[PDB]
Design a protein around this nucleic acid. Structure first.
Ligand SMILES: [Mg+2]
Ligand SMILES: [Mg+2]
Ligand SMILES: [Mg+2]
Ligand SMILES: [Mg+2]
Ligand SMILES: [Mg+2]
Ligand SMILES: [Mg+2]
Ligand SMILES: [Mg+2]
Ligand SMILES: [Mg+2]
Ligand SMILES: [Mg+2]
Ligand SMILES: [Mg+2]
Ligand SMILES: [Mg+2]
Ligand SMILES: [Mg+2]
Ligand SMILES: [Mg+2]
Ligand SMILES: [Mg+2]
Lengths: 104, 116, 155, 119, 50, 203
RNA sequence: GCGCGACCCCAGGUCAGGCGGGACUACCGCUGAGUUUAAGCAUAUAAAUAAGCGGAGGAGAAGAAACUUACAAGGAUUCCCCUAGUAACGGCGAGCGAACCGGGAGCAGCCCAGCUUGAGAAUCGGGCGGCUGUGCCGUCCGAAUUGUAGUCUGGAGAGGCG
RNA sequence: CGCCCCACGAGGCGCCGUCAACGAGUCGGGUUGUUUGGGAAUGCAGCCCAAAUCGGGCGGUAGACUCCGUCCAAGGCUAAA
RNA sequence: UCCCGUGAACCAUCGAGUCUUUGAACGCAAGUUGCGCCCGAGGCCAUCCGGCCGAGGGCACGCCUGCCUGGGCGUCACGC
């Protein structure tokens, strides 16, 4: 699942960005991804992390839209297309991407 | 109450009637007559006992008692034992000396099976 | 088992019972209990058998008439947590506390709560008797929230 | 004697052959006792004949015994499935599948979805 | 002793059945290596301890 | 909603109301055996929060344990060793009395499974605990999703392995950070890991 | 001259069930040395080890912060590398000795108790009968109001509106 | 690939501010013994004392006050490496 | 007779079976095949339409759910 950008702790590393556990609730809500839907579509959550500085919050919001842009979702059944599903053309062009599809 | 001592009041115990038998397969009689009477003994000492003492010597099961030996000799060989004497031989088998009631003849019983 | 239980009442006697626990030991009279228990027997809840035919009957009212029409059946309320809830909302009008609840801490504070909330309360004698009204073994508390318009005077 | 020719018989007839094979074995013990030479080797045949007949009667009696009790009645301890003590004490798949109301609503709403990327 | 138990008499009987030289035909079998009974016992040389 | 009142009064343990009720109960407990089946929890609200339900298969037992420490059980107080290990009579058992009680119930009640336990009383000589046990053969248990976990084989004798609440206490698992890091996964598992000499292939 | 109802205890070869013992590689709990090193020896070390007493599984234990940090902060558990023979501890002697950060392997979070059915215990066990039979249905007993079910678990949540 | 079509119940999401309940001889403190790298005391255990709800536990030197960061114990389950 | 087939085998393999006496070992014991009790298909006579020898099979302990039998002024109601 997708991991957000975080700054490391401790003077020695605070100038370096790395992957964190999961997106905060505010990052999820600002990008409009409901709390209980995100792990089901490939996005990790972290109910513990905080947003003390605006720039960090903005950066991780853009990742969710970037992920949402290139995300495709198959229907839960054969022909019914509910909210959030995709076009049949989209679901044939879909492969198993491998590696780091969003590098940090 | 007249007695100072309180005893345990006596109550009803109901008998067993289980809702399924713990054993379906019946019991075979594993000590039937052929298990009880294995084979007659043909040592020269035994052959003496047939004429001199109207007696028959068998090797019998180690778990057969004098009573079942008497029964099994009536089912098999259709004769009567006046007296049965037993000993467990030094090598582990039981030997039974059968004395026939004076109606039957031990020699004729010996012939009908083949020992003499 | 006999030896210990007899000494238990004796030791209770000897020790000084504090007021909150000796607020029991002062039960409602026999004369009033027969009066009160006459009323409670009127408002017994629906028996187990008394409850399945009506659900059988309301099947037809729903299946053909397409209306539920049964109106509010009015009966006593029981269960400690339920009665405590009714008391604090002030929907309770009469509380009936058994003298012989063990462990006692379940009801020791009810007299204070009913007195503070200004609902009349009585301490009848025998939790086994309260349970008999509601078709249980023991009950430990009862309360009447509303009586029919035929019994305002007697109530 | 043959396995097939016994499975196709009646109960009493099987009991006869047990009886007479038993008698033949008793007489062969006595040649060993007295004589020798060649019929000393019918014992192994006769001895296995008795065992085969005993197997037939016995294997038959459980088929009936299971059939009578296989109305899903309470079963006897000798007809119940002996696998291991641990297996018999497990929970059933229906028991291991009981989920709580909240947790199974978590699957009706919000299951784990199939998705891809690069689109 | 003459007074013995059945359990001791049973074990003594088995010990006797085991004091016998091997059958001669065992020596003829294919791929055989048994030469003699290597467990023979004599009452005066090795005690049973039971 | 009556459980709040009963719980608060149990907080006020030096009140005369609670001193009288506990004094008489402590008398009776001392008059009964050390391991006794009881019909209902004497502290139902404390039981509720520990997972007890009024369902068939839940049984509650009262256990009595002795107070004080653990004298070294040696033939006369004689130690054949260096003076550092010659003490006898101020030593303390490493399991709490709550844990001692639940296993006393556990061994005796070999067919049932310990769920939790809770303090009820004490005097100068004894402490009294009530242990919630479970019949994991009862069908009213095997069909409850919240308690099926206790029927699995990995939960046999939880109290003898230190896995109840009392066990989690004397194992140092109530706490998380530094000040508790050596207790996880276990104190002996931590010691073994720190003891290992890792000789890698390319070294 | 009673029969009551409940409470707490009986005794049952009562119906149906589950318990104990075995094995030692690895796992969980308890208990617990001394040889040895200090060129003697007593704290120390050997060692929170050997022996002793128990309990499990295919893995076990731990696990979702009453955590760390002092930073632009991070974010369950476990394991590897590094931190590090370091901070510390120590007749400050002999010696002993982790953790945070960082990098990897693998990643997943859940459920209860409590104010909140009261027009209604909506829950559960057992006997018996039936069938599609790891269960479902009918019925009769019983558990439970000193509380079974449903809601709810702080990240929330109950309400109200849309 | 086939038939069956999910709802007026629950959930998400938008606003609201009225409520908002959260584990007790337990925490916590003293003292004793053990244990630890944990040093005015790292965990654990005995006994004594014994809570709170603008409250509680921490911020590796004991102490009082002002501020600041941080988390919410005393019930339970949980793969993979 | 087992040889163009129900078919050899110190064959392989495994689902149907058997499984003496013990042992956690369970009716009480044990340098004892010692000492009890209960049920009981089958057969004999009549001292009953009962009694005699029975093939086989039960009877340990703690515990849970239910049940049956019972005890105690422990708490009541109702009486006498
Ligand atoms: Mg003799
Ligand atoms: Mg000599
Ligand atoms: Mg020593
Ligand atoms: Mg120790
Ligand atoms: Mg050494
Ligand atoms: Mg030295
Ligand atoms: Mg030296
Ligand atoms: Mg020396
Ligand atoms: Mg060891
Ligand atoms: Mg585990
Ligand atoms: Mg270095
Ligand atoms: Mg060390
Ligand atoms: Mg200390
Ligand atoms: Mg766990």
């Amino acid at each position: 699942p997708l991991r957000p950008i975080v700054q490391c702790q401790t003077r020695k590393y605070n100038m370096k960005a790395r992957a964190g556990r999961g997106f905060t609730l505010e990052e999820l809500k600002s990008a409009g991804i409901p709390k209980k839907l995100a792990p089901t579509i490939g996005i990790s959550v972290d109910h513990r992390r905080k947003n003390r500085s605006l720039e960090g919050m903005q950066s991780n919001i853009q990742r969710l839209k970037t992920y949402k842009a290139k995300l495709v979702i198959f229907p839960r059944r054969a022909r019914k297309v509910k909210a959030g599903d995709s076009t049949p053309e989209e679901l044939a062009n879909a492969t198993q991407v491998q590696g780091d599809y969003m590098p940090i | 109450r007249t007695s100072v001592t309180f005893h345990r009041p006596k109550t009803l115990s109901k008998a067993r009637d289980p809702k399924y038998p713990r054993i379906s397969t019946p019991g075979r009689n594993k000590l039937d007559q052929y298990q009880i009477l294995k084979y007659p003994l043909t040592t020269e000492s035994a052959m003496k006992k047939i004429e001199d003492n109207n007696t028959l010597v068998f090797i019998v099961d180690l778990k057969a008692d004098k009573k079942k030996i008497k029964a099994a000799v009536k089912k098999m060989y259709d004769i009567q034992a006046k007296k049965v004497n037993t000993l467990i031989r030094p090598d582990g088998k039981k030997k039974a000396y059968v004395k026939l009631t004076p109606d039957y003849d031990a020699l004729d019983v010996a012939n009908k099976i083949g020992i003499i | 088992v006999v030896r210990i239980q007899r000494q238990r009442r004796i030791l209770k006697q000897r020790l000084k019972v504090p007021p909150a626990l000796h607020q029991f030991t002062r039960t409602l009279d026999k004369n009033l209990a027969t009066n009160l228990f006459k009323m409670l027997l009127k408002y017994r809840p629906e028996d187990k058998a008394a409850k399945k035919e009506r659900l059988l009957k309301r099947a037809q009212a729903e299946a053909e008439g397409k209306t539920v029409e049964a109106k509010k059946p009015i009966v006593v309320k029981y269960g400690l947590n339920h009665v405590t809830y009714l008391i604090e909302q002030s929907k309770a009008q009469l509380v009936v506390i058994a003298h012989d609840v063990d462990p006692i801490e379940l009801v020791v504070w009810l007299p204070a709560l009913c007195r503070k909330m200004e609902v009349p309360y009585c301490i009848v004698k025998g939790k086994s008797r309260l349970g008999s009204i509601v078709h249980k073994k023991t009950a430990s508390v009862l309360c009447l929230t509303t009586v029919k318009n035929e019994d305002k005077l007697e109530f | 004697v043959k396995a097939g020719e016994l499975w196709n018989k009646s109960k009493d007839d099987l009991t006869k052959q047990l009886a007479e094979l038993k008698t033949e074995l008793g007489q062969l013990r006595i040649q060993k006792v007295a004589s020798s030479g060649s019929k000393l080797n019918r014992i192994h045949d006769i001895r296995k004949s008795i065992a085969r007949v005993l197997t037939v009667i016995n294997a038959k009696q459980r088929a009936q015994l299971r059939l009578f009790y296989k109305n899903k009645k309470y079963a006897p301890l000798d007809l119940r499935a002996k696998q291991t003590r641990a297996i018999r004490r497990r929970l059933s798949p229906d028991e291991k599948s009981r989920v709580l109301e909240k947790t199974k609503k978590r699957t009706v709403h919000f299951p784990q979805r199939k998705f891809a990327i690069k689109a | 002793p003459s007074h013995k138990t059945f359990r001791i008499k049973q074990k003594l009987a088995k010990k006797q059945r085991q004091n016998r030289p091997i059958p001669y035909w065992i020596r003829m079998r294919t791929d055989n290596t048994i030469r003699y009974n290597a467990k023979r016992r004599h009452w005066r040389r090795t005690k049973l301890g039971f | 909603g009556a459980y709040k009142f009963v719980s608060e009064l149990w907080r006020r343990k030096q009140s005369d109301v609670m001193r009288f009720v506990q004094r008489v109960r402590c008398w009776e407990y001392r008059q009964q055996p050390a391991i006794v089946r009881i019909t209902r929890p004497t502290r139902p609200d404390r039981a509720r929060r520990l997972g007890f339900k009024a369902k068939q298969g839940y049984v509650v037992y009262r256990i009595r344990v002795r107070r004080g420490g653990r004298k070294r059980p040696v033939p006369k107080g004689i130690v054949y060793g260096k003076p550092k290990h010659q003490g006898i009579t101020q030593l303390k058992f490493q399991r709490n009395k709550r844990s001692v009680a639940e296993e006393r119930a556990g061994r005796r009640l070999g067919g049932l499974r310990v769920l939790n336990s809770y303090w009820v009383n004490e005097d100068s000589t004894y402490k009294y605990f009530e242990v919630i046990l479970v019949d994991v053969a009862h069908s009213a248990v095997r069909n409850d999703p919240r308690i099926n976990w206790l029927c699995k084989p990995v939960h046999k004798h939880r109290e003898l392995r230190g896995l109840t609440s009392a066990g989690k206490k004397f194992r140092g698992l109530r706490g998380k950070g530094h000040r508790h890091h050596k207790n996880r996964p276990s104190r002996r598992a931590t010691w073994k890991r720190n003891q290992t000499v890792s000789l890698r292939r390319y070294r």
